[PDB]
Structures are given as C-alpha cells and as structure tokens.
Design an enzyme around this catalytic site. Sequence first.
Site, short mmCIF file in Angstrom:
data_model
loop_
_atom_site.label_atom_id
_atom_site.label_comp_id
_atom_site.label_asym_id
_atom_site.label_seq_id
_atom_site.Cartn_x
_atom_site.Cartn_y
_atom_site.Cartn_z
N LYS B 141 42.78 57.38 26.41
CA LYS B 141 43.61 58.06 27.38
C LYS B 141 44.28 59.26 26.73
CB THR B 176 45.30 53.90 33.10
OG1 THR B 176 46.59 54.22 32.57
CG2 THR B 176 45.08 54.71 34.37
#
Lengths: 993, 372, 97
Positions: B141, B176
């Site tokens: 990420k 996520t």
Amino acid sequence: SNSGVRLDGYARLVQQTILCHQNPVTGLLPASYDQKDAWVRDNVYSILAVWGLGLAYRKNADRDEDKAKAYELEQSVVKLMRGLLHCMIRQVDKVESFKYSQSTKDSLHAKYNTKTCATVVGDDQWGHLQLDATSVYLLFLAQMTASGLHIIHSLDEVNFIQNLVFYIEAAYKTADFGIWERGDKTNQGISELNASSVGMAKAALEALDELDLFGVKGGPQSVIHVLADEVQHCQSILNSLLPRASTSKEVDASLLSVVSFPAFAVEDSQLVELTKQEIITKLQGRYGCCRFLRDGYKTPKEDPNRLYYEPAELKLFENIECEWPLFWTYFILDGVFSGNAEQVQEYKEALEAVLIKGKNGVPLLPELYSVPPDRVDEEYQNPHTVDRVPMGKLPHMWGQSLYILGSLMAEGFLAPGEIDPLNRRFSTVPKPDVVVQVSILAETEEIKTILKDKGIYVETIAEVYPIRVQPARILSHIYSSLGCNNRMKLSGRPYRHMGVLGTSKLYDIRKTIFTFTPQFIDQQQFYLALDNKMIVEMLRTDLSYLCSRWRMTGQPTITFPISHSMLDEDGTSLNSSILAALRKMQDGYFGGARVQTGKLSEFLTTSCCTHLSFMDPDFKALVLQLKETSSLQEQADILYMLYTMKGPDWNTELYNERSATVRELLTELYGKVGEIRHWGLIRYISGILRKKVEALDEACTDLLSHQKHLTVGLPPEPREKTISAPLPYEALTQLIDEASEGDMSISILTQEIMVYLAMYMRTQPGLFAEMFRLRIGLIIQVMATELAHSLRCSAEEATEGLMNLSPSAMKNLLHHILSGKEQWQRRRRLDGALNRVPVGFYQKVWKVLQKCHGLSVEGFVLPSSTTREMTPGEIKFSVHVESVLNRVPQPEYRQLLVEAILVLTMLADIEIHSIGSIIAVEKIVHIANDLFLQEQKTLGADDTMLAKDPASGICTLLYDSAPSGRFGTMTYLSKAAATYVQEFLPHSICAMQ
Amino acid sequence: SAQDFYENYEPKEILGRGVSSVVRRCIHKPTSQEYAVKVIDVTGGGSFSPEEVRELREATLKEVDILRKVSGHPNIIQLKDTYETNTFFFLVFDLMKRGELFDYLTEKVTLSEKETRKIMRALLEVICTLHKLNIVHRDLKPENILLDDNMNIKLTDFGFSCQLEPGERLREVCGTPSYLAPEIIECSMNEDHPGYGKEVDMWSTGVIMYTLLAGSPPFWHRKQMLMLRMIMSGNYQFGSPEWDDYSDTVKDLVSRFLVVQPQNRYTAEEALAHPFFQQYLVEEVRHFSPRGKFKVIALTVLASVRIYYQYRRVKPVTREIVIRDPYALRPLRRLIDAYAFRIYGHWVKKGQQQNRAALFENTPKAVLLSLA
Amino acid sequence: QLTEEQIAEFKEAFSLFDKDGDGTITTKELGTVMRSLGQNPTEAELQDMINEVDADGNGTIDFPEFLTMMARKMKDTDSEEEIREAFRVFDKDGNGY
Ligand SMILES: Nc1ncnc2c1ncn2[C@@H]1O[C@H](COP(=O)(O)OP(=O)(O)OP(=O)(O)O)[C@@H](O)[C@H]1O
C-alpha cells in the site's frame, strides 16, 4: 605603560562625554539635549561603560591613583543605582496595586525627573508601562551585586526588590508600550505584547533566582526567591512568538537585545542566526539599521508636532526610514562576545565612517540619520542610494557608551567573564538529558497491601514522620506570605496556582523536609481528576514537560499518592490504567521521560532542596420535599431553584442538631455524586459552585500567542465580543459568565473546551493551523449536531448525551471533530462551521482585490482601496476578510463562496487584464446553480432529484457533488465565473498566457 | 536490558503514530547518529486479556525474525538493534527526513513518468528479492511505502508478512478492502478455494501503479458490497480524458498487472524484462543488410516529419471551449484538480471510507445513479 | 509491440539528430537542422514546440521522449496528409517522382 596610557585616554573620553552630566546629589544624568528628564533604561545603558572602565581599572591595583580612580567609578555607579532605587521606591503605592488587576494606569512612571526625584509627567500624558526598563535594571543590579559592588543597604530594600520581581513576573500575559513607547506601528493609544519585554523579564528572573544582595556577608534572610514556572512560561512564549517581532510588527531591530550580549535570553542558536539573518536582510543600511518597517519618527512630513497618527501610512514612510548606529554597536558586541573576530573588525570599519567628530576631536555617535526632504522620490525609486544627514541628540549617551564598551572589550582590556559573572554566555549549550524520580505512596493500609499483592512495593502515608505530604494549596498559601511588610504597606505575593515544576522540588520549613503532591490531582478543585484516563494522560504530559526544560539545578522528585476514588467497582483492586502506568514507571519508561522508582529517603540524598527563611518565627414545605424527594437529578434541580430564589447563603434548616448552610449541603451532594460516578448533575453542581478551571489565563495566553482569536458562546451580532489581547483571571471569568448567561453549564463546557484546545495546541501544533478564529459556541453546536446525527435523536436528547459524556469521551470526540474524520453536504457544513480555509487564501484574496475593483457578497461591499493600507502578512486584513465573508450565516454557502473566490483567483492568474468593475460572487454561484439545474434536466433527472434549498436556493445534489471530477462543482464554478467575466467585458475575451 | 537502551538511545519528539505504537527519533550517543526508535506497548493500558499480549509478542517476534532474515538489503529497511522488556518493546530503524508516499502523492497529485518508472522498478526489485527468499507481504500500500532525500522508496510494516513454504496456502484475510485478489474472496466464500498464493503482490503492484498514475484507486465505491463485487468481477476501466495523453506501454503493463486470473498474471522477472524498464548505453552489433539501412532511413524521415507537425498542431487559448467545457484544456484541468486537492488536503489519511477517489466524481449525479 | 530493428532505427535517428553526442537533441542543433533542410521556424514557435513535446518545463528533450512521440497514432487522414507532405518536400524538382 602603553596599556596605562590607553586606559587614561578612555577615562578622559568617558569623563568628557558621559560623566560630565553626572548630576550630583541625585546621580541621574539627563537624557541628552534640552530635555532635563531621566530615563531608567537610558541611564542603565549609559552606566555600562563606566562600570566596565571601573572593572578594567580595578585589575591594575597596588597604586594609590588607580585605586582612587576605580573607587570613584564604583562609587558613581553605586550612586546612580541608589538614585534609581529611590526613584522606584517613591512609587511603592503604584507598585503594590499593579500587583492586583494589571493595568496601564497602575504601573510606575517610566519618565523620572531630575534632582529632588519627583514625577515630571501625569498618569495619562505618557505611556507609563515599560517592563523592559525594570527588567534590565534588576538584571544589571544582580550582575553588579555578583561582581562585588554593594547597593542594597536595608531589608526594606530587599522587600521592595522582591515586590518588584513579583510585579514583573506577570510580563508574559500583559500588553505594554514596548521599548519605543509607541505600541504598534500606529500609536492610536494602543499597546501590544513585545518579545523583548518578556525576554528581558525572563532573564532578570533567571539572574535573581537565588542571588544574595548583601554579598558574601549576607545571610539566609537576604536572598531573593523566584519561581521557575514563570521563567519556563516566558521561554515557551518567546519560542512560540519569535519568528517575527510581535503580532503586528514583522521585524524589529530591538530583537538583537534578546539574542546578543544584553541578557542573553534566548536558546536554539539556529533560531538566533535565523533572526539575525532576517534582521540584516530587512533593516541593514548605509548608516546603521532601521528600527522597524513603516516608522515615521524624525520624518520631513506627518506634522512632527502631532501624535496618534491616523491610519494613512500606506507609502509615506516606506523605504525612507531612519537608521540607528546603536544596532551596529549591538552587532559589534554580539560578535566580540561569543566567538567572532572578523565580523567585529568589519563592523568597526563600517561604524568608523558613520562617526562624526565633536569638540577637541572627540568621537560622537549621532542618534539617527534622516533623508533630506528634497531627495525623497529618489530614495523610493532607488533604495539606499541618497545621502542622509545627522539629526537627533548628537551626544547619544546610550550609543556612545555601548560603542566605548565594545571598543574596550575588543582592545582586550576587558574579558567577557567580567561583565557577566553569572555565566550567561553558555545559555545556548544543549542540555544532555535529565532523570526524573517518582515516588508512590499508599493512603491507607489496604492500598499498600493491594499493591504488595500486585508486585508493587510502596510506603504508606505513615512511617515517614520526618517527611510530610500536603497538597499544593498549602504551598501556595505559604508562598503568598513572602515579601510582606506592614511599615511599607506591602501585601506580598498574590495567590496563584503552582505548576508541576514548583511542587517537584523539595522544601525545608522549620528544619523539616516538606514535599507537595502535584496540583492537578485535586478532585475538590474540579472534577477533571475523577477520570482515570485524564489522570494518566495529564501525568504523562506533566512528566514530559518536566523532562523537557528542567532549568533548575538538582534532580527532581514527583510524589504520586494512590487515592480511594481510583479503585474498581468492587473496591478491591486498582484500575487497569493506573496499574499499567505504575508498571511502565517500574520499567524505567513512561511517556517521554526516564523514571526510576524508589523511596523518598533515597531521593532525599540528592534532590532540589529549598530553604524558606521567611517562615522562621413555603420554605418548610420546599425543604421537606427536597429532603424526601428521589430522582437525584430532580433533587439537584430543586436545590438550584432554592439557591436562585432564597438560598444564596441562608441556612436551609434541614437538620435540627446542627445548622448546615446551603454550601455544606452542596458539598455533601457533590461528594455523594462523586462516588456513584454519574455525569448528569456534575455539570450543574460545578456551575452552581462557580468552580473555574485553574490556570485559565495561562491557557488563554498560550492560545493567543499564536495569533488566534477566541469567541465564546453562540454568535449573535451584538454580544460575544471578540478577544484579541490577554486579560486577567477576573476579567476572563466575568466575560465567560456573561457569555454563558443563565445557562450556567455553558460556562463549564466552554472552559472544558478551551482547556482541551490549549492542551492540544502544545502537543500537536499542526492540527490548529489554517484556522484564524476559534468559536467555542459554534464548536458546541457542531458537536451537538453530530451527536444528534449519530444517535438519530432530538436536540434535547443530544444535549443530554453530551452532558452525560465523560471528560475522556469529550476529549476524544473533540479530537475526532477537529481531525475532520468519521456525506458531502455534512462535510461542507463541517468545513464552513469551523471556517477552515487554505493557508494561501489571504494572499489570493489580496491579489484579487489588487486586480479587481471589489467583491460583492450580496450585501455591503469590500473596496479595493484597502490593499494599499494593508499588507498580506498583517492580521487586520485577514480579520477584515473574515468579517466580510462571515455575513452569510450558512457554512455550506461560506464554503461555496470560498471556492468561488479560489476559482476567480485562478482565472485572474490565467487571464492578464484589469476587471475594472465589481463582481458579485453570489451572482456567480447562482449562475453555476442554474447551469447545474439545466444540465440535470437535460440528462434526465426528474423533479425529486432537482431539489430546492428552503432558505438558500441551492440544489442538494450540488452540495453532495464532489469538488473535482467531470461533473464536479469546480467546473460549474469556472463556467459561471467566465460567464460573468464575459458579461463584464467589452464584447470579447482578454485571457491569454 | 532497558538500561542499555536508555543509555544508548535518547527519546525525542514524536515522528509518527500507529494503532498501538509510537515512533520517535533517537540519537546513538557513541556515534551521534540520527536513527529512529519504534515503541509498541504490550498490555496497551490493560485493555485486553494476556492472550492478546502473547499474540502481539508472537507478531513482533515474527516481524523481527523476518526483518533479520532480509537484513543487509540497502533498498529494504534495516533493523540495526532490537530490544525487548517486560512491558515495552524497543526497535531501532533508520530515520528518514521525508514522509510517506501518501503525503507526497497527495501533495503532487500525480508524479512524473520518471518518478513512477523508478518507483515501479524499485518495488519490483523488492518483490523479486522477497520471493527469492519465499516471503510474501500482502500489504503493498502507498501508506506502507515511504521516501527519503534520494527519492528512493523502502518497504516497511513487515509484521503482516510471514514466511511460507511451498505447498501451503494461507487463509486469513487482512488489509485495505480494495487490495484483495479474487483468490481471497474465493477462499472466504465458504470453504472452496484452497488459500493464498503469490499473485496478491502482483495485483497490489498493479493497484499502486494505477493509483499513482491516474491519481485515484482503480476500484472505489460508497458501498462495501458494490466495490467488492466490482473488484471480484475485474471490470476496471481506463478513464477517457485522463489516460488519453499517456503511452501504450504503461497501459498494457498495468493491464497485465491487473489480470484477474493468477496464472495469466505477469511475474516479477517478466516485468523486469518489459521494454519499459530496459535501458541502453552503447552497442556496436547493429549491423545488417542495406535493406535495414534503408528501413532505418525511412523511419528517421517519418519521425522527422512527425516532429515537424507538432508545433503547428498546438491549439490556441480558445476561450470558447473553456466556457463550454473546462476539462478540454489539460493544463487548466490539472490546475483546477490541484486547487481542489489543496482545498481538501487535510482529509487524505488511512481508511477505505475516505481516499483520493472520493474527491473525484466522474459518474453523473442523475436518475441513472439510483439504479444498481 | 516494437521490434529490434525499430529500436535500432530510433537509436540511429536520435544519434543523427544532434551533431554532438550529449543525450539531448538541443534547441540549437534542431534549429541548424531545420535551416539545413530549408525551413526557418520562429524562436517563439520553436520554444512552444519544445514545451509541448516535453512533459515539463525543464527545456530538454530526451531519447525516451522522442520514442514516445514517434509512438503516437495518426489514424488515417493524418497519415495520408503526412506522406503527401513528405512526398511534396522530397519532390522539389518538377518531375513527379
Ligand atoms: N523511519 C521512519 N520515518 C518516519 N516515519 C516512520 C518511520 N518508521 C515508521 N514510521 C511511521 O510509523 C508508522 C509505521 O506503520 P505502523 O505499522 O506503525 O502503523 P499502523 O497504524 O499499524 O499501520 P500502517 O503500517 O498501515 O501505516 C507510520 O505512521 C510511519 O509513517
């Protein structure tokens, strides 16, 4: 000897220049020219050369002539000091009342007359508020006392000096006229905080921390005691207020007097170099440095025989300000003191050219240089090109004395350690580290047994008989009786709260060691100490604070007693948070400090110990209903209504054996409620008792130190007057009560929010950026609205839940709200309510106003003529723009206007031309809304999608629309702005780049 | 022990915050270095049972073991010294003057071609080096990627990563919600699909590329289930006015990196072999027949004629299209996008609910939005 | 997809574009080439072309930038227009070939 000849020449120069106006009997020299008035600061700075000359002569002893000359010089210095001391003593009444309710009319007069030591001007014809002069006088008195000179002759003088120290200790939260005695750039009978004032006050407090005024022969009764909390507060204030001169001045040449030889009241040498670089860049000239930007002193205009100049200095004094060689002498002293040699030579070479000769070829330092009236346009068109002429007091005693001292130091006849016996030259040396000691005690035997069962070894309140533990209130009460005299009518130190840095150090009273618990664990004063999470967080913050500065010598000690109110529901074990904090402290690490656990006796071997020498020797039906009623909340309401009706202090006659007043019953109810830990009537009880958060003024000045505005309560037009300057505790409490009105609990909520905001300012000073004004009432309304939205309840239920919310929950909620974290309509409402704008919004608005005739916000007008009167970096323009934009009461509409202004700024950057007309941003947003409605109708949206605002005429989908995107609001705003520009253009477009 | 850490490391101002850890700068007194120390609580203020404490201790020991396994790589973060106490964990890293990739991305909106190329090369090197040691991160990420003064990215947050053996597949789901391969949803449906694989990092890299280039995550929606179904179906599309002025090589590289089928997804070695990442300095083996020389001359002439037409094809100010549509002008669109980002630049943090794609609304807010 | 022969041709074109080897086509070298071909572009036009071709305001064009520019698709009409212009430039003499 050659050195003797040079010293004789310097003595002749001093006698012919400064000592010629000794003014015997009194010893106060006139401030040059035909003034016949004596300035404390001027005389103090002038006597520096004489003191240095005497110190130089004292070294060459063993001769009658040299000894006589040195004795004469020291006697002259002592005579001047005694004259100044007597002049201050003549205003004992003013000194004593200034201590309570600090005002401009209560301070001693800065202008002191000649012989007979009387007042020369009235209390309203001059600015009689200059803490810098008192601070420098006290500092230099301490320096000469440490050198060896005797000045103080009686204990009454010691008491007066202590009272003066108390009077100057409040310099960090008061506004004065400053060094120039003119406040900000425009006089207008206004005063503002100055960095030099607070810096010199802090330096004077540091110098007189434990100085003995009677010298080596002095006893314990002749020592001055100064708190360390005030010094650290002043240090923090200066650190948070020294990227510029003050709130209104972008730069001042007097900032050298804080970051150089005088008082050395600065740290972080990088900041010192940075400030010196900006001062050189913005003030240096061909004949010295200017005092500050946009000053009209000694100018060929502005009607010199006038005062309180109207706000019309747009371009009159710009680029033609006078320059003073006194700042060049400051630079010479700064270079010659620390480590610089080449800079000293270059500055001396520069200064020798601007020197003008006098009688018998004597050097003289002119006060300032002024631009000739004929060559005014040339200087503006070509800066620093014309030649100025000398003016002002030609025998400038301050500048000449400073130059003589600098030359004497450069010649090597004097050492930096002679004028500074206190070793203030090493104030910039980094502090390596500090170890803090924490001692934990058990109130009762059960607490000690529980801690022992949990692997914690402590000592109870007993079995420590040589040591005594008392709250900080006793310490405060004791310190309130210091410097008390009846013959001179001195009331001593006013009552004030004691910080963590004060209660940490040990105190010896009557040959007994006394320790005090920190002031923030007092549940009686306020209910903040009830919450365990607040206890641990505030303890960690206090520990961090203590570990950060610790400017006092010796190791510290913190005592943490374990109370019975932090136990669990069953009352058999400690709470999780307190146990975790104790375990972390055991491992030698908590928050951001290194801790070691041990016994008080062990810490007694090495610690900070202070010795206090001064301590040496139908109504009946209502009462029955109140007694018999259930529903404790209704009981509190009943108590409140009788308190408001007939129970201010009258006895309720509830009991028969003993008559207990309403206050006793209120305290009993508070104590009973504190056990159940139910936050429904605690706010009401606190409001009835009128309990105020301690150090509220400290929080207010900490918030205001960063150029912020505070507004309390809901905003109507008339009330909630803004706060721009620090105010005393009484005035702040009165304003808070007036804003709260009859709601009572509103004042408590406002105090809680204010203290939370102040606490979060220090820890995270990036969250509060981009915000210019803080509205406590608007914040309260926003929090209530979010509570109602989350609980899907009514406004009354939301308010009840807010009241029932724990203080830790309140702090977490405020943090979450300020973070702006958790649809677009609610986000826009939150952004508008807290008036959050980009950092460069002010510059963009200023540029637009420069490039346009004005802006229309559907009501009134903002003229473009204010751009010349104002500057982008000045706060007045910013608050003017905020007030102009605050007319619309819709936060969403405010955000729409802000983004319309931004897109108009972008268009003006793209399009080079002059608009030459008034543009209506309301018309622009209306056109954008109409275009959005037309596009929605064309796309196929029906009547339910094309909603209409009940009181704003804006589609709901426009609010819900994202800012950026193919169908974003910014595209429609750009289209509307360009359409308006085309409508206000001569049938064509004038945009190219 | 803790005494040695205290005598060797000096706590300083806070540099970062985590779910249960605080990161502060430290100074090594013998060296006067400027390293950083990461402190994570064990008991967390006594907010959970000791089972959570031992689980956290196991997580930290796995993280430190993995970091020591890959120690020595300059591009990978390095753990100089590690300390463990009863209630406090001390780890030493290399402090970096620049912030995370999220902050730079939100400040610059969109990075340059060279910047994204070098970032992609560094990240691909990271993934092949990790795969050579049989280590998968599954948490690629922008928030976990930082930058230094040399504009070099280094991967952090190795706690989620765990060492794996051939023939075993993982089943836990984390990260996520917009960074899941179809394998995750297939395995988590009830029990059918075996487990995790190795192409999760591949799709994570593709998502990083799309987010950094286009400026928004490829998949985003206001509803969990809607965007979950969208990412599972793999119905991503390239924006019309954003990807029009871009090269085809990056487009097909991204498309290969976003393949729904794990077998067809390009490996790291194939990605390095792509013409995007190859470079040439000098060669002397470019010899062929006169036909090759004629073809080279013809191609040179064609390129010269193409470059001869660039300046005459530029559009003027054209305020007409500006008033009718402000998105036509690429510089104007970039300027307004940057202004919009700066207006709401304080609302881009960790969390799927609010991200870069939230600020962009390409879909029309009309009656068709009701249908789902 | 590209080819090795195309890459070699592009490298040769980049090398021949500039008189001196420095990795940049250079505004001065481009102007000299244009004058040699028989064209006299204006300074403002050349600056605008350099700015448009470049991805930023650095003012330098590199070999990857030239490769990306050559990778553009002209569709159909632009292709025939370009080949017609090239033929017209090459057919300076009145011979039709
Ligand atoms: N050397 C460093 N310089 C700057 N910041 C650092 C450094 N090392 C760690 N950090 C910060 O510490 C955090 C590292 O992630 P951490 O695992 O602690 O957080 P988290 O809340 O669990 O989630 P995430 O890992 O997804 O950010 C980030 O906030 C990062 O900015």
